[PDB]
Amino acid sequence: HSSGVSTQSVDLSQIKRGDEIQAHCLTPAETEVTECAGILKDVLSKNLHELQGLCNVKNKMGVPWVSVEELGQEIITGRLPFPSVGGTPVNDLVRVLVVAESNTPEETPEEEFYAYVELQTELYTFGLSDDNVVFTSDYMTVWMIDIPKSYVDVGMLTRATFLEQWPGAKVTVMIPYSSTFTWCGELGAISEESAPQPSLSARSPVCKNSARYSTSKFCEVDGCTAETGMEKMSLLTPFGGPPQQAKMNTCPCYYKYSVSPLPAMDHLILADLAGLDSLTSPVYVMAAYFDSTHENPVRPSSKLYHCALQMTSHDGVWTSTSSEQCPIRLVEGQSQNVLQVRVAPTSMPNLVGVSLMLEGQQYRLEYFGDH
Amino acid sequence: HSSGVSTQSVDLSQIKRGDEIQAHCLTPAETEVTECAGILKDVLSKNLHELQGLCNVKNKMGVPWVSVEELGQEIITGRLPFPSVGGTPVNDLVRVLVVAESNTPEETPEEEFYAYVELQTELYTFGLSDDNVVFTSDYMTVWMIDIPKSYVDVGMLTRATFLEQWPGAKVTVMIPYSSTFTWCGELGAISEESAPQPSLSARSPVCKNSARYSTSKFCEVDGCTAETGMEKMSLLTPFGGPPQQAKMNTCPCYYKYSVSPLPAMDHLILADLAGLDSLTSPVYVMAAYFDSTHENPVRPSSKLYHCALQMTSHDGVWTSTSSEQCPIRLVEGQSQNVLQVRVAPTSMPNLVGVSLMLEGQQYRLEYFGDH
Amino acid sequence: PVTCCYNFTNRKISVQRLASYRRITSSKCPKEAVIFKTIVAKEICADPKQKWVQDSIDHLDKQT
Amino acid sequence: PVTCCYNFTNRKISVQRLASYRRITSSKCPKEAVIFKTIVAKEICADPKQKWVQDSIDHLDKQT
C-alpha cells in the first residue's frame, strides 16, 4: 500500500552508533551540523537506510503531486497526524530529523536529485536550508533542525518541492517525543489525479465540554457509576478497520474535572485493545501529562512531559515496559488477547492525553478542549 | 455605556511609587507577593484607584451576569480583545495584575465581598488564588501572576465568580506589553437580560491567503504598483463609529512575501487616521515583530517583540514618540488632521502585526494568518 | 461504598447554602478534604487549607 | 522605476526554465540579489550565497 501505520522495537545496541545518532542528531545539542554530519556520513555510507531502524512508530500517507510548471516545481504537502500535544511554551526544543528521498532511476536523469523541505506554522516557517544538511547521497538528503515543541503539532504543515516527479519520492519527519520514543511522519507522493490517501489516524476529545464534568450530576446519565465501575466505553476502530478492536473510556473525565465526591477506584481504564492473538508487531501508548510536583501560585511552571510504554510479544506472551514517572500503565486484560491502558484516578487532573499506536491504527485521546 | 476604548498619557514620575509598582507588580520579578503587596498597601490605602493611572489604553466590554442557583453564583465571563499577538513559546513571561471590584452599597451587605477570577487557556487554567493576592479592601481585590506571553491572546478566557450581582462589578486585567506600555482589558457586568456589549474592537488579517503575495502577479489587480504608490486603502471604521476615520493598506503584504522584484520605496503606509482636529486624547499604535538579527539555521530563534508609539497633542500640535528598535513610526499626514503609521519596506518580512488604539476604536492588523 | 475527593472547588459557597460538612477519613481516599453538603443535599469538595473553608466550618460549628 | 528584491526564493528553479539573470546594482535597493528571468519573462529574486544560484549563474554564462 501507499498509506498506513506501523511499529517495531528500537534497540540502539544493535544499531551502528545508535547512541551517538540519538544524542547528536535526535537531541538538541551542538548548534552546528558538524557533529551529526560526521556520524551520519560514516553510518549511512555503509547502510543507507539506517534511520528507519530508529522509528518506534511509523505513520504514513499518500498526498497528490501538485505542479507549478512555470518553474518546473513538483510539490507535495500535507498535515502529519501528530500523535499527541506538541507541548507548552515552557518546554524546551525538539531536534527533528527530516529525510527527503526517492527511488534510484535505472537511467541517469536530466539533473541531480533535489528537494527543499519546509515546516510552516502560523507565525514562522522553518526551512531546511543547506545549512541544515547532515547527509547527502545521490537520491536522499537529510536535514536537522531544532524547533520549539509547542510548534510540532496539528497546525504545522509540511511541504516538499522537487524538480521532477520522482518515483518513490517521499519525505519523512522523525520526531523524538522522549529519549526512547521516536515517531516518524511520512508523506509519500501518489499520482496527481489521485485523491489524498490518509492513514487510519484519528483525534478524539474524550471530554467535550469539560464543565459537564465539574460535578457528578450527569454520572448516572453517562453510565459512570460505582455499579459500572466507571466504564462507559465507545468504539475507536471503524467498521472496516484492521482485526484489532480499540475502545476508549469517557468516565475518567469525572476524575479529571469533578469537585463532587467520586467512587474510590484502585485504577481507571482509559482504553483497551482486543485482538492481540493475531497482532504481530508491538503496541505503543504515549501519554502527555503535567508534573504532579507543587507549583508557585505566582508562576505556575507548566512544562509538558511525554512518556511512551510498549507491549510486545515474547514467545506468544505479551508484557509491558514500565516507568515510575509515567502516569499510565499497560496491562493484559481478562486474557492475553486484550490489553488495557490504566491510570490511578488521582492522576487524571494532570493527564493531558494518551495515544494508541499499532499496526494500521493510531488514536490520539485528548482530555481537554472540544476538538 | 459599559463598553468603550479610552487613552491617556502615563507619567510614572507623577505616580506615587510608580516605578516600584512597575518593577515589582508589572514586571516578572520576585516569585512572592510580598514586595508588591507592600507597595500597594501603602499606595492604594492612600488612593484606592491609583492603578488606573497606569493604563495607557483601556478597552472595556459589557458582559451579562450568568446565574447559578445552588451555590449563589453570579458569573461574568468574556473574551478580551487583546490588542496583539501575545508571543512565541521562545518569549519570557508577563506579570499581569488582575482587579475584581464593584460599587460599595450604602447598606452593609449580609456577607463579605467575594470574587474568584481565572484565566483559562485550552490546556491550563491560571487561577488567582489567595496566594496571588497583593491587595484587598472592602470592595476590591488585586491579584498578581506571571503567565507566559504566548498564552495571553485570543483564546484565553476571563471568568469572574461573585456571590451576588454587585452593582458595578467589574474585573480588569492589566497587561504590560513593554516597559512603557500597559493595556487594560475590562469586563463590566450588565443585566442578565441584556445582550453582550462589545467595544468597537476589530482584528484584521491584512494578508489573507499570503501565498497570493508570493509573486507580483496580482499587483495590478490589487492596485499595488509604483503609480498608486503601493497604496490600496480600505476603511476600518464602521459606518456609525466615532468622528475619527482609520484605514489600512494591504499592499505591504507584497513586500512581506514577494520573491518577485518590487518598486523601490522610501517607506510604506500601513495605515492612517484622520479626524485629529477633534480628538481629545492620545493615539497609541503598537507593533509586534521579530528582531532582524541573523540567527542559527539549525535553531531559528523566534523571540517576538513589542513597541508602542504615542501621538499626542501639545498646544494644538500633534507629535509622536520615536524609537530606535521599533520598526514603525508615526508621522503627521498631509495635514495635522491626519496621522500615518509608516514603516520601511525591508521591515515587512519580520513585521507580525500593528494595532491602532484611540478613543472608542481599536484595530488589530495582522500580517500573518487568514483568521 | 466510599467516596473521595479528587479535585477541590476553587469557588467559595455561600454560607447560606451550606447545610453541613464532614471530613474525609477513609484510608481509601488520596487527599485530605472537607466535604460540604448544600441545603439542596449536594456535596462539594473543598481544600481545608483555604481560609473561606475554615470560616464556613467555624460558622457551621456555631449553629449546632 | 527601480525595482528591488525584498525576499529571496528558497526553491531552486530548474535551469531549463531560466533565460537570464542580472544582479542588483542600484543604491536605492536594500539587499544584494540575483534576478533570474524565466523563459516566460518572469523575474524571481535569488540569494547569491546559495549553491543552486551560483551553479545557475555558471550555466547561463557558459552558454553565451
PDB file of all heavy atoms in Angstrom, chain A residues 342-367:
ATOM      1  N   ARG A 342      -4.064   1.707  31.814  1.00  0.00           N
ATOM      2  CA  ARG A 342      -4.556   2.094  33.127  1.00  0.00           C
ATOM      3  C   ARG A 342      -3.911   3.312  33.754  1.00  0.00           C
ATOM      4  O   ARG A 342      -2.812   3.724  33.372  1.00  0.00           O
ATOM      5  CB  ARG A 342      -4.411   0.937  34.105  1.00  0.00           C
ATOM      6  CG  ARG A 342      -5.261  -0.259  33.790  1.00  0.00           C
ATOM      7  CD  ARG A 342      -5.140  -1.243  34.924  1.00  0.00           C
ATOM      8  NE  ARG A 342      -5.871  -2.478  34.679  1.00  0.00           N
ATOM      9  CZ  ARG A 342      -6.131  -3.372  35.624  1.00  0.00           C
ATOM     10  NH1 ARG A 342      -5.721  -3.152  36.864  1.00  0.00           N
ATOM     11  NH2 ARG A 342      -6.783  -4.488  35.330  1.00  0.00           N
ATOM     12  N   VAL A 343      -4.606   3.867  34.742  1.00  0.00           N
ATOM     13  CA  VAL A 343      -4.111   5.025  35.458  1.00  0.00           C
ATOM     14  C   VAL A 343      -4.803   5.122  36.812  1.00  0.00           C
ATOM     15  O   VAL A 343      -5.942   4.683  36.973  1.00  0.00           O
ATOM     16  CB  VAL A 343      -4.368   6.315  34.657  1.00  0.00           C
ATOM     17  CG1 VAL A 343      -5.837   6.713  34.749  1.00  0.00           C
ATOM     18  CG2 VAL A 343      -3.481   7.412  35.154  1.00  0.00           C
ATOM     19  N   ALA A 344      -4.099   5.666  37.793  1.00  0.00           N
ATOM     20  CA  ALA A 344      -4.683   5.846  39.119  1.00  0.00           C
ATOM     21  C   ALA A 344      -5.582   7.076  38.978  1.00  0.00           C
ATOM     22  O   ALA A 344      -5.175   8.068  38.372  1.00  0.00           O
ATOM     23  CB  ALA A 344      -3.580   6.099  40.160  1.00  0.00           C
ATOM     24  N   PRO A 345      -6.812   7.025  39.523  1.00  0.00           N
ATOM     25  CA  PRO A 345      -7.800   8.114  39.473  1.00  0.00           C
ATOM     26  C   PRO A 345      -7.223   9.495  39.748  1.00  0.00           C
ATOM     27  O   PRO A 345      -7.561  10.483  39.100  1.00  0.00           O
ATOM     28  CB  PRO A 345      -8.797   7.714  40.556  1.00  0.00           C
ATOM     29  CG  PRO A 345      -8.789   6.234  40.461  1.00  0.00           C
ATOM     30  CD  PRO A 345      -7.317   5.912  40.346  1.00  0.00           C
ATOM     31  N   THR A 346      -6.337   9.542  40.726  1.00  0.00           N
ATOM     32  CA  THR A 346      -5.719  10.772  41.158  1.00  0.00           C
ATOM     33  C   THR A 346      -4.733  11.396  40.156  1.00  0.00           C
ATOM     34  O   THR A 346      -4.230  12.493  40.385  1.00  0.00           O
ATOM     35  CB  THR A 346      -5.038  10.532  42.531  1.00  0.00           C
ATOM     36  OG1 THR A 346      -4.717  11.785  43.138  1.00  0.00           O
ATOM     37  CG2 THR A 346      -3.776   9.699  42.367  1.00  0.00           C
ATOM     38  N   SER A 347      -4.466  10.717  39.041  1.00  0.00           N
ATOM     39  CA  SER A 347      -3.539  11.244  38.033  1.00  0.00           C
ATOM     40  C   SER A 347      -4.221  12.000  36.888  1.00  0.00           C
ATOM     41  O   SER A 347      -3.556  12.718  36.139  1.00  0.00           O
ATOM     42  CB  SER A 347      -2.688  10.116  37.431  1.00  0.00           C
ATOM     43  OG  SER A 347      -1.751   9.597  38.361  1.00  0.00           O
ATOM     44  N   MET A 348      -5.541  11.851  36.761  1.00  0.00           N
ATOM     45  CA  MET A 348      -6.302  12.498  35.692  1.00  0.00           C
ATOM     46  C   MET A 348      -6.232  14.014  35.619  1.00  0.00           C
ATOM     47  O   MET A 348      -6.157  14.576  34.529  1.00  0.00           O
ATOM     48  CB  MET A 348      -7.772  12.087  35.757  1.00  0.00           C
ATOM     49  CG  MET A 348      -8.034  10.627  35.415  1.00  0.00           C
ATOM     50  SD  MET A 348      -7.276  10.150  33.844  1.00  0.00           S
ATOM     51  CE  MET A 348      -8.217  11.240  32.684  1.00  0.00           C
ATOM     52  N   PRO A 349      -6.267  14.708  36.770  1.00  0.00           N
ATOM     53  CA  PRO A 349      -6.203  16.174  36.702  1.00  0.00           C
ATOM     54  C   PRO A 349      -5.025  16.691  35.869  1.00  0.00           C
ATOM     55  O   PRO A 349      -5.141  17.695  35.168  1.00  0.00           O
ATOM     56  CB  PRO A 349      -6.098  16.581  38.171  1.00  0.00           C
ATOM     57  CG  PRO A 349      -6.852  15.478  38.876  1.00  0.00           C
ATOM     58  CD  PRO A 349      -6.361  14.242  38.165  1.00  0.00           C
ATOM     59  N   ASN A 350      -3.901  15.983  35.934  1.00  0.00           N
ATOM     60  CA  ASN A 350      -2.701  16.383  35.212  1.00  0.00           C
ATOM     61  C   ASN A 350      -2.488  15.659  33.893  1.00  0.00           C
ATOM     62  O   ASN A 350      -1.555  15.977  33.156  1.00  0.00           O
ATOM     63  CB  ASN A 350      -1.471  16.190  36.107  1.00  0.00           C
ATOM     64  CG  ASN A 350      -1.239  17.369  37.047  1.00  0.00           C
ATOM     65  OD1 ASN A 350      -2.183  17.997  37.529  1.00  0.00           O
ATOM     66  ND2 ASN A 350       0.024  17.666  37.318  1.00  0.00           N
ATOM     67  N   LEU A 351      -3.343  14.687  33.591  1.00  0.00           N
ATOM     68  CA  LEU A 351      -3.209  13.937  32.344  1.00  0.00           C
ATOM     69  C   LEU A 351      -3.807  14.740  31.202  1.00  0.00           C
ATOM     70  O   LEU A 351      -4.986  15.095  31.249  1.00  0.00           O
ATOM     71  CB  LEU A 351      -3.929  12.597  32.456  1.00  0.00           C
ATOM     72  CG  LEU A 351      -3.622  11.628  31.321  1.00  0.00           C
ATOM     73  CD1 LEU A 351      -2.161  11.249  31.402  1.00  0.00           C
ATOM     74  CD2 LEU A 351      -4.501  10.384  31.428  1.00  0.00           C
ATOM     75  N   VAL A 352      -3.000  15.037  30.184  1.00  0.00           N
ATOM     76  CA  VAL A 352      -3.488  15.813  29.045  1.00  0.00           C
ATOM     77  C   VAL A 352      -3.977  14.894  27.922  1.00  0.00           C
ATOM     78  O   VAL A 352      -4.897  15.236  27.184  1.00  0.00           O
ATOM     79  CB  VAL A 352      -2.397  16.788  28.526  1.00  0.00           C
ATOM     80  CG1 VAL A 352      -2.911  17.563  27.319  1.00  0.00           C
ATOM     81  CG2 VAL A 352      -2.010  17.770  29.637  1.00  0.00           C
ATOM     82  N   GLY A 353      -3.367  13.718  27.808  1.00  0.00           N
ATOM     83  CA  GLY A 353      -3.785  12.764  26.795  1.00  0.00           C
ATOM     84  C   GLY A 353      -2.951  11.492  26.707  1.00  0.00           C
ATOM     85  O   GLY A 353      -1.894  11.369  27.330  1.00  0.00           O
ATOM     86  N   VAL A 354      -3.449  10.524  25.945  1.00  0.00           N
ATOM     87  CA  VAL A 354      -2.736   9.276  25.723  1.00  0.00           C
ATOM     88  C   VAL A 354      -2.992   8.952  24.266  1.00  0.00           C
ATOM     89  O   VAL A 354      -4.019   9.341  23.722  1.00  0.00           O
ATOM     90  CB  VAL A 354      -3.258   8.113  26.618  1.00  0.00           C
ATOM     91  CG1 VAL A 354      -3.119   8.483  28.101  1.00  0.00           C
ATOM     92  CG2 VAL A 354      -4.697   7.793  26.270  1.00  0.00           C
ATOM     93  N   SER A 355      -2.050   8.268  23.630  1.00  0.00           N
ATOM     94  CA  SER A 355      -2.201   7.909  22.232  1.00  0.00           C
ATOM     95  C   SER A 355      -1.904   6.441  22.045  1.00  0.00           C
ATOM     96  O   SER A 355      -0.940   5.920  22.606  1.00  0.00           O
ATOM     97  CB  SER A 355      -1.256   8.737  21.365  1.00  0.00           C
ATOM     98  OG  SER A 355      -1.447  10.119  21.602  1.00  0.00           O
ATOM     99  N   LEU A 356      -2.736   5.785  21.245  1.00  0.00           N
ATOM    100  CA  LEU A 356      -2.592   4.366  20.977  1.00  0.00           C
ATOM    101  C   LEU A 356      -2.092   4.168  19.552  1.00  0.00           C
ATOM    102  O   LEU A 356      -2.718   4.621  18.586  1.00  0.00           O
ATOM    103  CB  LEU A 356      -3.934   3.666  21.171  1.00  0.00           C
ATOM    104  CG  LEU A 356      -3.980   2.166  20.915  1.00  0.00           C
ATOM    105  CD1 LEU A 356      -3.121   1.429  21.945  1.00  0.00           C
ATOM    106  CD2 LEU A 356      -5.424   1.701  21.004  1.00  0.00           C
ATOM    107  N   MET A 357      -0.954   3.494  19.429  1.00  0.00           N
ATOM    108  CA  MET A 357      -0.359   3.238  18.131  1.00  0.00           C
ATOM    109  C   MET A 357      -0.091   1.756  17.911  1.00  0.00           C
ATOM    110  O   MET A 357       0.587   1.119  18.709  1.00  0.00           O
ATOM    111  CB  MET A 357       0.950   4.029  18.008  1.00  0.00           C
ATOM    112  CG  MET A 357       0.756   5.513  17.748  1.00  0.00           C
ATOM    113  SD  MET A 357       2.142   6.506  18.323  1.00  0.00           S
ATOM    114  CE  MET A 357       1.957   6.238  20.127  1.00  0.00           C
ATOM    115  N   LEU A 358      -0.638   1.202  16.838  1.00  0.00           N
ATOM    116  CA  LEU A 358      -0.407  -0.201  16.494  1.00  0.00           C
ATOM    117  C   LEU A 358      -0.605  -0.338  14.996  1.00  0.00           C
ATOM    118  O   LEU A 358      -1.058   0.596  14.337  1.00  0.00           O
ATOM    119  CB  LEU A 358      -1.373  -1.148  17.213  1.00  0.00           C
ATOM    120  CG  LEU A 358      -2.850  -0.990  16.845  1.00  0.00           C
ATOM    121  CD1 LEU A 358      -3.601  -2.309  17.031  1.00  0.00           C
ATOM    122  CD2 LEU A 358      -3.453   0.111  17.703  1.00  0.00           C
ATOM    123  N   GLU A 359      -0.263  -1.505  14.461  1.00  0.00           N
ATOM    124  CA  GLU A 359      -0.399  -1.762  13.032  1.00  0.00           C
ATOM    125  C   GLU A 359      -1.710  -1.236  12.468  1.00  0.00           C
ATOM    126  O   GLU A 359      -2.794  -1.620  12.907  1.00  0.00           O
ATOM    127  CB  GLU A 359      -0.281  -3.263  12.766  1.00  0.00           C
ATOM    128  CG  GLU A 359      -0.549  -3.689  11.330  1.00  0.00           C
ATOM    129  CD  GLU A 359       0.342  -2.985  10.320  1.00  0.00           C
ATOM    130  OE1 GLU A 359       1.574  -2.952  10.523  1.00  0.00           O
ATOM    131  OE2 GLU A 359      -0.189  -2.470   9.314  1.00  0.00           O
ATOM    132  N   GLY A 360      -1.602  -0.331  11.507  1.00  0.00           N
ATOM    133  CA  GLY A 360      -2.781   0.223  10.860  1.00  0.00           C
ATOM    134  C   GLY A 360      -3.735   1.070  11.680  1.00  0.00           C
ATOM    135  O   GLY A 360      -4.830   1.374  11.220  1.00  0.00           O
ATOM    136  N   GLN A 361      -3.343   1.470  12.880  1.00  0.00           N
ATOM    137  CA  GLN A 361      -4.247   2.280  13.687  1.00  0.00           C
ATOM    138  C   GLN A 361      -3.534   3.196  14.656  1.00  0.00           C
ATOM    139  O   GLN A 361      -2.600   2.786  15.332  1.00  0.00           O
ATOM    140  CB  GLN A 361      -5.193   1.382  14.484  1.00  0.00           C
ATOM    141  CG  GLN A 361      -6.046   0.447  13.667  1.00  0.00           C
ATOM    142  CD  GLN A 361      -7.041  -0.290  14.530  1.00  0.00           C
ATOM    143  OE1 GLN A 361      -7.872   0.324  15.196  1.00  0.00           O
ATOM    144  NE2 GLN A 361      -6.959  -1.613  14.528  1.00  0.00           N
ATOM    145  N   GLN A 362      -3.989   4.440  14.718  1.00  0.00           N
ATOM    146  CA  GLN A 362      -3.439   5.424  15.636  1.00  0.00           C
ATOM    147  C   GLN A 362      -4.571   6.285  16.188  1.00  0.00           C
ATOM    148  O   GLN A 362      -5.290   6.933  15.427  1.00  0.00           O
ATOM    149  CB  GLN A 362      -2.428   6.323  14.936  1.00  0.00           C
ATOM    150  CG  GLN A 362      -1.922   7.416  15.838  1.00  0.00           C
ATOM    151  CD  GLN A 362      -0.813   8.220  15.222  1.00  0.00           C
ATOM    152  OE1 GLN A 362       0.300   7.725  15.014  1.00  0.00           O
ATOM    153  NE2 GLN A 362      -1.102   9.476  14.925  1.00  0.00           N
ATOM    154  N   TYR A 363      -4.732   6.286  17.510  1.00  0.00           N
ATOM    155  CA  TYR A 363      -5.773   7.081  18.138  1.00  0.00           C
ATOM    156  C   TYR A 363      -5.182   8.032  19.157  1.00  0.00           C
ATOM    157  O   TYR A 363      -4.479   7.614  20.081  1.00  0.00           O
ATOM    158  CB  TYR A 363      -6.814   6.174  18.801  1.00  0.00           C
ATOM    159  CG  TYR A 363      -7.480   5.255  17.815  1.00  0.00           C
ATOM    160  CD1 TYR A 363      -7.214   3.879  17.825  1.00  0.00           C
ATOM    161  CD2 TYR A 363      -8.272   5.767  16.785  1.00  0.00           C
ATOM    162  CE1 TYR A 363      -7.699   3.045  16.827  1.00  0.00           C
ATOM    163  CE2 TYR A 363      -8.767   4.933  15.773  1.00  0.00           C
ATOM    164  CZ  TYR A 363      -8.472   3.574  15.798  1.00  0.00           C
ATOM    165  OH  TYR A 363      -8.927   2.743  14.791  1.00  0.00           O
ATOM    166  N   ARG A 364      -5.450   9.322  18.964  1.00  0.00           N
ATOM    167  CA  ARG A 364      -4.968  10.364  19.860  1.00  0.00           C
ATOM    168  C   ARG A 364      -6.119  10.794  20.771  1.00  0.00           C
ATOM    169  O   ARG A 364      -7.071  11.458  20.330  1.00  0.00           O
ATOM    170  CB  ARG A 364      -4.456  11.549  19.053  1.00  0.00           C
ATOM    171  CG  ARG A 364      -4.069  12.756  19.894  1.00  0.00           C
ATOM    172  CD  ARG A 364      -3.308  13.782  19.073  1.00  0.00           C
ATOM    173  NE  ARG A 364      -3.353  15.109  19.675  1.00  0.00           N
ATOM    174  CZ  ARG A 364      -2.618  16.138  19.268  1.00  0.00           C
ATOM    175  NH1 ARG A 364      -1.772  15.992  18.254  1.00  0.00           N
ATOM    176  NH2 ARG A 364      -2.729  17.313  19.875  1.00  0.00           N
ATOM    177  N   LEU A 365      -6.027  10.397  22.039  1.00  0.00           N
ATOM    178  CA  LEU A 365      -7.049  10.708  23.031  1.00  0.00           C
ATOM    179  C   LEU A 365      -6.734  11.967  23.821  1.00  0.00           C
ATOM    180  O   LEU A 365      -5.749  12.001  24.558  1.00  0.00           O
ATOM    181  CB  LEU A 365      -7.210   9.524  23.991  1.00  0.00           C
ATOM    182  CG  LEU A 365      -8.157   8.400  23.547  1.00  0.00           C
ATOM    183  CD1 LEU A 365      -7.966   8.055  22.087  1.00  0.00           C
ATOM    184  CD2 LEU A 365      -7.924   7.201  24.420  1.00  0.00           C
ATOM    185  N   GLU A 366      -7.574  12.993  23.667  1.00  0.00           N
ATOM    186  CA  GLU A 366      -7.387  14.278  24.359  1.00  0.00           C
ATOM    187  C   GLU A 366      -8.389  14.444  25.501  1.00  0.00           C
ATOM    188  O   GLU A 366      -9.590  14.252  25.313  1.00  0.00           O
ATOM    189  CB  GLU A 366      -7.579  15.454  23.390  1.00  0.00           C
ATOM    190  CG  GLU A 366      -6.809  15.375  22.082  1.00  0.00           C
ATOM    191  CD  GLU A 366      -5.327  15.623  22.256  1.00  0.00           C
ATOM    192  OE1 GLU A 366      -4.706  14.922  23.083  1.00  0.00           O
ATOM    193  OE2 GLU A 366      -4.783  16.515  21.564  1.00  0.00           O
ATOM    194  N   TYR A 367      -7.905  14.828  26.677  1.00  0.00           N
ATOM    195  CA  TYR A 367      -8.785  15.014  27.823  1.00  0.00           C
ATOM    196  C   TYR A 367      -9.048  16.488  28.071  1.00  0.00           C
ATOM    197  O   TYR A 367      -9.479  16.883  29.153  1.00  0.00           O
ATOM    198  CB  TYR A 367      -8.174  14.350  29.058  1.00  0.00           C
ATOM    199  CG  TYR A 367      -8.042  12.856  28.883  1.00  0.00           C
ATOM    200  CD1 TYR A 367      -6.854  12.297  28.416  1.00  0.00           C
ATOM    201  CD2 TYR A 367      -9.128  12.013  29.084  1.00  0.00           C
ATOM    202  CE1 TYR A 367      -6.754  10.941  28.141  1.00  0.00           C
ATOM    203  CE2 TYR A 367      -9.038  10.653  28.815  1.00  0.00           C
ATOM    204  CZ  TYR A 367      -7.849  10.122  28.338  1.00  0.00           C
ATOM    205  OH  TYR A 367      -7.751   8.780  28.038  1.00  0.00           O
TER     206      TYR A 367
END
